[PDB]
């Protein structure tokens with residue numbers, strides 16, 4: 001008390017413009033470069049995310065892991081009018097920071113926070129949250145959950161031909177089982193985007209895995 005996440009939110013509120021997502025991203029990146037490192041996707045990998053979002057213009061995006069809402073703000077600002085982001089966050093303190101971050105950025109109408117474990121929420125998406133299929137999934141939660149949640153998404157019928165999975169941290173901390181699985185599966189077309197760990201001179205990367213159907 002206070003936490004790093006509360007300090008990041010306060011910094012944004014006092015160093016960005018309300019309703020200006022770009023200024024929010026810049027404020028978070030400045031804080032995390034100059035004051036305290038935090039596990040936001042960051043600008044380096046964020047620019048790759050931007051390129052992917054702009055290519056596919058997804059109407060419905062699922063994010064696994066919100067943290068402080070950096071990637072939610074990053075993706076939501078590039079969504080077309082009426083397009084929507086659902087973000088799953090198990091940590092209630094993170095969920096509170098993310099909501100306030102979205103509110104400040106003026107993106108609250110485009111993004112909905114789902115509270116709970118992804119393994120509990122994913123099976124509820126169709127009946128409770130009126131989802132048919134997902135256009136894109138951003139994986140950025142517990143690294144050992146990338147593979148089981150991907151398999152659960154398929155089981156629940158939430159993936160379609162062309163659904164884009166984009167996974168953060170496939171190098172550091174790394175997601176070896178997920179990476180081996182999607183790269184070895186005929187149901188995925190994979191591309192690796194080499195980059196750097198947020199705010200650090202350390203190699204990381206994103207994996208894009210496009211679902212091909214069964």
Ligand SMILES: O=C(NCCc1nc(Cc2ccccc2)n[nH]1)c1cc(-c2ccc(F)cc2)cc(O)c1O
Pocket residue numbers: 039040041064065066067088089090091094116117118140141142143145168169172173197198
């Ligand atoms: O752990 C990370 N992220 C998960 C954060 C998170 N966990 C939740 C709980 C939740 C659970 C289930 C479902 C939805 C949410 N929400 N958000 C993460 C770590 C690092 C990193 C750390 C130390 C280091 F030395 C190097 C790198 C870098 C990263 O980019 C990351 O994303």
Ligand SMILES: [Cl-]
Pocket residue numbers: 039040041042066067068069070071072140
């Ligand atoms: Cl993030």
Ligand SMILES: [Cl-]
Pocket residue numbers: 041042043044045197198199200
């Ligand atoms: Cl960065």
Ligand SMILES: [Mg+2]
Pocket residue numbers: 039040041140168169
């Ligand atoms: Mg990450």
